[PDB]
Amino acid sequence: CEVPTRLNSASLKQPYITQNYFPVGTVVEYECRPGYRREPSLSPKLTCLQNLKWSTAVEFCKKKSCPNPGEIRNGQIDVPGGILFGATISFSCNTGYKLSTSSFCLISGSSVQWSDPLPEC
Amino acid sequence: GYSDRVRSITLGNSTITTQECANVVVGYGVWPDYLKDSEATAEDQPTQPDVATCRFYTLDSVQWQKTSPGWWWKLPDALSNLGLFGQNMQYHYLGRTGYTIHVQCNASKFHQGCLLVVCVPEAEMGCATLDNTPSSAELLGGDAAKEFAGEPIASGSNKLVQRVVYNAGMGIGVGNLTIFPHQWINLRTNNSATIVMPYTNSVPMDNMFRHNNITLMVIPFVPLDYCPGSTTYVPITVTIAPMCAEYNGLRLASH
Amino acid sequence: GYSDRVRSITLGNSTITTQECANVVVGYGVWPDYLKDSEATAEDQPTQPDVATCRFYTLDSVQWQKTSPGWWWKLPDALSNLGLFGQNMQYHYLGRTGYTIHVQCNASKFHQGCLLVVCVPEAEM
Amino acid sequence: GAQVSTQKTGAHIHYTNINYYKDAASNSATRQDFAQDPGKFTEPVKDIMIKSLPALN
Amino acid sequence: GAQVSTQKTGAHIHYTNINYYKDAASNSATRQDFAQDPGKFTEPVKDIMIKSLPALN
Amino acid sequence: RVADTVGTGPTNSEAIPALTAAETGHTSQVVPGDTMQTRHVKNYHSRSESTVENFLCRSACVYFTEYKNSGSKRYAEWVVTTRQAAQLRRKLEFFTYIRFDLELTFVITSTQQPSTTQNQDAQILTHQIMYVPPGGPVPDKVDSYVWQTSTNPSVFWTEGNAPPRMSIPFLSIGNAYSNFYDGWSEFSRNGVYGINTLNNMGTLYARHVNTGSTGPIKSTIRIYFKPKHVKAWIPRPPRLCQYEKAKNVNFQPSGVTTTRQSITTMTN
Amino acid sequence: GLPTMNTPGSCQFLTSDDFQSPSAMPQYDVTPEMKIPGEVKNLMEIAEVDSVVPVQNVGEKVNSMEAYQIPVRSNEGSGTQVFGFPLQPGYSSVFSRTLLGEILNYYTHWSGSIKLTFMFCGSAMATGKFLLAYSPPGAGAPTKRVDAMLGTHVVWDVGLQSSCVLCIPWISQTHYRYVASDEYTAGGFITCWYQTNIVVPADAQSSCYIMCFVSACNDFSVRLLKDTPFISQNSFFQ
Amino acid sequence: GLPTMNTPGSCQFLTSDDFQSPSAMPQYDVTPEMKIPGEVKNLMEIAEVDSVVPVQNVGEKVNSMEAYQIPVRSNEGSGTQVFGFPLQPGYSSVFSRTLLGEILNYYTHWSGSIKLTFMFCGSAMATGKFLLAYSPPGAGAPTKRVDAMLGTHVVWDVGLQSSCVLCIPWISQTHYRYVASDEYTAGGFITCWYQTNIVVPADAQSSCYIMCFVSACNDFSVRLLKDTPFISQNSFFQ
Numbered sequence A: 001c002e003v004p005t006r007l008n009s010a011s012l013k014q015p016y017i018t019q020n021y022f023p024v025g026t027v028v029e030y031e032c033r034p035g036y037r038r039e040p041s042l043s044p045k046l047t048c049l050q051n052l053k054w055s056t057a058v059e060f061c062k063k064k065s066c067p068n069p070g071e072i073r074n075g076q077i078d079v080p081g082g083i084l085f086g087a088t089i090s091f092s093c094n095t096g097y098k099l100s101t102s103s104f105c106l107i108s109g110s111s112v113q114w115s116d117p118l119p120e121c
Numbered sequence B: 001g002y003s004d005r006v007r008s009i010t011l012g013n014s015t016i017t018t019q020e021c022a023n024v025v026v027g028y029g030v031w032p033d034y035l036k037d038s039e040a041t042a043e044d045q046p047t048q049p050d051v052a053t054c055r056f057y058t059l060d061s062v063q064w065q066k067t068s069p070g071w072w073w074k075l076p077d078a079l080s081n082l083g084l085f086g087q088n089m090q091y092h093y094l095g096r097t098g099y100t101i102h103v104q105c106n107a108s109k110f111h112q113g114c115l116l117v118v119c120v121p122e123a124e125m126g127c128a129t130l131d132n133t134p135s136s137a138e139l140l141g142g143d144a145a146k147e148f149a150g151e152p153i154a155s156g157s158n159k160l161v162q163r164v165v166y167n168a169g170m171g172i173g174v175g176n177l178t179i180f181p182h183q184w185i186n187l188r189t190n191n192s193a194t195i196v197m198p199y200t201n202s203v204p205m206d207n208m209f210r211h212n213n214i215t216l217m218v219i220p221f222v223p224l225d226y227c228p229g230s231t232t233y234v235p236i237t238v239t240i241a242p243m244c245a246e247y248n249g250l251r252l253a254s255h
Numbered sequence C: 001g002y003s004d005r006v007r008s009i010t011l012g013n014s015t016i017t018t019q020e021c022a023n024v025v026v027g028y029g030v031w032p033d034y035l036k037d038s039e040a041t042a043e044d045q046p047t048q049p050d051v052a053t054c055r056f057y058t059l060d061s062v063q064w065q066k067t068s069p070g071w072w073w074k075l076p077d078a079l080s081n082l083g084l085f086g087q088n089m090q091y092h093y094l095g096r097t098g099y100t101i102h103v104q105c106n107a108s109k110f111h112q113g114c115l116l117v118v119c120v121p122e123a124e125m
Numbered sequence D, E: 001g002a003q004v005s006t007q008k009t010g011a012h013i014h015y016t017n018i019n020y021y022k023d024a025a026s027n028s029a030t031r032q033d034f035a036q037d038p039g040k041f042t043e044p045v046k047d048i049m050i051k052s053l054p055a056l057n
Numbered sequence F: 001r002v003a004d005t006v007g008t009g010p011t012n013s014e015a016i017p018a019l020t021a022a023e024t025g026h027t028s029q030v031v032p033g034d035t036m037q038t039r040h041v042k043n044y045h046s047r048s049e050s051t052v053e054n055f056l057c058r059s060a061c062v063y064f065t066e067y068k069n070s071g072s073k074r075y076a077e078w079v080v081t082t083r084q085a086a087q088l089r090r091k092l093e094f095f096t097y098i099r100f101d102l103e104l105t106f107v108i109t110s111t112q113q114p115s116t117t118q119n120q121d122a123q124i125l126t127h128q129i130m131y132v133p134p135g136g137p138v139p140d141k142v143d144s145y146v147w148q149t150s151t152n153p154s155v156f157w158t159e160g161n162a163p164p165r166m167s168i169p170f171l172s173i174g175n176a177y178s179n180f181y182d183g184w185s186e187f188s189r190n191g192v193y194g195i196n197t198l199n200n201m202g203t204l205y206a207r208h209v210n211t212g213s214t215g216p217i218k219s220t221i222r223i224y225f226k227p228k229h230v231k232a233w234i235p236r237p238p239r240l241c242q243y244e245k246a247k248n249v250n251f252q253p254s255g256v257t258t259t260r261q262s263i264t265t266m267t268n
Numbered sequence G, H: 001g002l003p004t005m006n007t008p009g010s011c012q013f014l015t016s017d018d019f020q021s022p023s024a025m026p027q028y029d030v031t032p033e034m035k036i037p038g039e040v041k042n043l044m045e046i047a048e049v050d051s052v053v054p055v056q057n058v059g060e061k062v063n064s065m066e067a068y069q070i071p072v073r074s075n076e077g078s079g080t081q082v083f084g085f086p087l088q089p090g091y092s093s094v095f096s097r098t099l100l101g102e103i104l105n106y107y108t109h110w111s112g113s114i115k116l117t118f119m120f121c122g123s124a125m126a127t128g129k130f131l132l133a134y135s136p137p138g139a140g141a142p143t144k145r146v147d148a149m150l151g152t153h154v155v156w157d158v159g160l161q162s163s164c165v166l167c168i169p170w171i172s173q174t175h176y177r178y179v180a181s182d183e184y185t186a187g188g189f190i191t192c193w194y195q196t197n198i199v200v201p202a203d204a205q206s207s208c209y210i211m212c213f214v215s216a217c218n219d220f221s222v223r224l225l226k227d228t229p230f231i232s233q234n235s236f237f238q
């Protein structure tokens, strides 16, 4: 068999990463890359079949959700792309008040948090 | 005998009288009615209050000055907080109604001017910044009137609506608007203008809080003028009566 | 075939089902109706919502304890703040309606007790 | 099952049409629907207005 | 020997079909067989069950 | 057939056809024979090219994109929308609500790119155009399993043949298409505002089924939309300003018309 | 094998053609139609409604509403000119952006009569009389009321009815006139003159405005689809 | 030689086309048909049968049968919530893998009513009453019984008949709702609340389970063939 199939959601577990000879009937395990959270229904294992081809692979992990943005006083929050990992919210202000401008959901430690805090306006 | 310059309208417990009126414009020739069984889609039974909902509601007045560009009103939004109409459309998910609009202006024989009173269906508007879209507060004014602007709104990092009077905020031509059922108030001829509009939409019913079907635009084409000594405060009043209103999907009140 | 211990009631967009019920008591033998032209006094036209107003509203629950004396409810007051019914009677000066009351209690075959459920007209206290 | 209709000719000679597909969205375009009613846009008023009479009398 | 049948049009105009081959497996697909009978999967019971009556009485 | 003129003569009556009040908004139905003496001439002119169909029933390019047989961009995608170009958009915007069937036509053209590979002897290229309805599995790569096109519709074209053409029915969950929308995606009057909320026509993909040659080749697909069986409602004024975006009606303010010397000038 | 022969014009894509084509979504069930107010069947229906004419399009006046107002005021003279413009709905800047002009710019030939409606927007105590004239071509624009009186004119008396309609007829040798600028298909000149003088009482403004509307007549007609010059684009939007 | 002309769309392979083609095995004699029980003529026949709904799909519960059990137990309180989920058969994880959901994921538009059948699986000596409510969109999910009572509800009384059916009607402005997630075509919310309290005798378990089945109504309908998102493949099998 060749190298196991690359998947955006997960990454090959150690030490399979440092391995280049896979006989038939060899099982490899994956793990969720940051932030990505493991999906309980799907199981992250692949087997080299007799045809020297790996078993069908599906995304075993899903993007983590950032907390709710909140409610900026005298301000409007624009959420064009949800609140998943990698989204960007926009902070605006009403007519008659002066105002950062945007915040990004990024991995900070073991979970995902917003970057810029809510401004004042 | 009769004249044709006098007209009375009676709806619910309200009446409107006029001594100097032009004719009455009736939508696209269609009178508002209810929804038929061969054209409905929702299955539960609708409610039809028919008395409290179908009555004349009188919004605030606006002063017409020698330099006023004009005003606009979103009818589903204008009556949202007024009377049972507001309570009905609040609890319900779907709504369907036709709007009759009466706009009245009072003056003397020594005052001059001209207003265009037009009902625009689906008056989608633009923003001062080409990127980004207009904010709800700028587009929708409730319990109040929104005003156009004589000069172009500046573009910056803003969500303000482009209010140019010559582009009517839609980028089109103000003169060509007549394609929509309209009327004029010529201060030498008629005190008031009345338009009856049926329910126009592409679906049978629609949520009255997230979509505004029609928009009323009062635009002075000839500026108000008078000689010193005569009255300087001339207001404009708008009365709206819902007609054949039915609602479906009773649910928890939406604020 | 049928039994007579099962009964369903449908009003507006609401339904009530029962598996162990006695009969249904109907007022003084009179079923609620509208006001006739030969018995009315007010002259303007009435409003009849007939769907949102005519539906089952469910008040709170009360715990029945070994030493509970009893409870009472004023119906015009109980539904005053609930649903369109409250909004209708709020804006309007005059009103006229009939009330259907369903009171439900759930227990086992090893629990014992007895409740009287009564509608008193003009219960001046 | 063919349709024979007149063509577009100058004033002052028939054509034949057969439908081959079974979807009614695959037919040709309807180019010959000459029907008008401008009374909805012109003259949308409620009371009729005779031309020779004064408008406001 | 042609067949003329109605097309699939919206609610609220005929088509012509000729078979050229002699095998009956070369014809077009049968797209217009709208017949249903869900009583085999829904309600496969032996004794009829009226809706308003109690199921087990 | 257009209405013929009627012969009239002199007049000294009390009938005032010319005098009217435009305050009502009623367009005056006067003919030349009312304010002058006229002859009777039969009119044979016809309003046959002014019908809604004959007006919008013409092919118009709405998009074109380029994909290659090597490198990075191996396939092309397009989110279906008629607002990409200006001409057909402005012709369609004459009406608020329109209902119409669509006749789609595709033009595909290839071109050899400058390189240094010797001995170039290409073969005939075949192209595949796959349409994915919203909610479907979009191709993530050019050799994706989704190209099977079991349920999804697909068209295969070999270069040198006639351009591919198919007919699409009136697809809409509503009772008519909406050129304009005055509302928000959410019931709370926040989020996407405009016709973008209504749009949901899916995505269209295109790829080379074979490499064809050892040298680089770039192909370009052009999409043509001809409306047929057209029905339209509520007309509205034509776009005076120039368009700026496809998702919105945002514009830059412009004057009503073009300026002349004075109010008594017979020339531009 | 039925012997056939292929004629020229095979495997070609003519954009204005009318053929059948296989449906991509077979047996699709479309949403049933519903009654919608204001159905357009013919473009001429749109051309027969009034549209305000930007007559005073001079200088910066096009950047406001002043482009729509015709400024008539009382003066110590008689027989002066109010306005004048040519009869070129497709080409003249005056009628180019009106509903009629915007519909004409999609075609190449036009033929029919033109209706002009003038509405007085002054005081109720003001009065006046105007001469509204149309002169077919052959001699230039009339420079004085004596020359404009000899054409097709109407004398408008301002009173209770504030609107008067001037109907420009069809006096063209050609059956159809070109929408673009062609000196062969000349149209003529439309002018307006003070018949008497504006009469205003004391304490009443002496400077008033007129408004002008244009609409197509019943005999109107257009005959060649083309592309509007105004629409433009540098690159695909968004 | 009959003169013909070839139109665009010639020598092309549209996968959803309907033409005749020469048979590769001429005059082949097929095996005569025989009566086979359970013939399917329409997909909707399959969508109208009940399918157990995995309501409790929380955590590892999807890796067992516990995903199908709704855990109702006696408590010292009234008016609490049992469950709640949105009306999205195509998109919601709750209805995505049910027969109805598996059939919907092959299409793009759906339209009709939904039947939910709740079966009590407790002791024969247990009793209770439940409120099953549906709220159309416009205001968010009801957070308490007072807000959920104002919608379309049924009061279910547990007795000899252990199953009660809640029929979600069609209250959509659009004729057809999108199977994928679109906020324009919102569906609403379905919730359940303790009407009274579970009444259990001594020596009888006080913790019971409910089960839920979903079926399409007679008015149900779907309108655009597409490819299921769930099916996948890295390379040809075997």
Ligand SMILES: CCCCCCCCCCCCCCCC(=O)O
Pocket (backbone or CB within 6 Å): F080, F081, F082, F102, F104, F129, F130, F131, F153, F154, F155, F166, F168, F171, F177, F178, F179, F199, F201, F204, G024
């Ligand atoms: C084999 C290729 C098939 C391609 C199918 C493409 C279908 C496109 C459908 C577009 C319909 C018209 C969209 C109008 C949008 C609007 O105005 O709201």
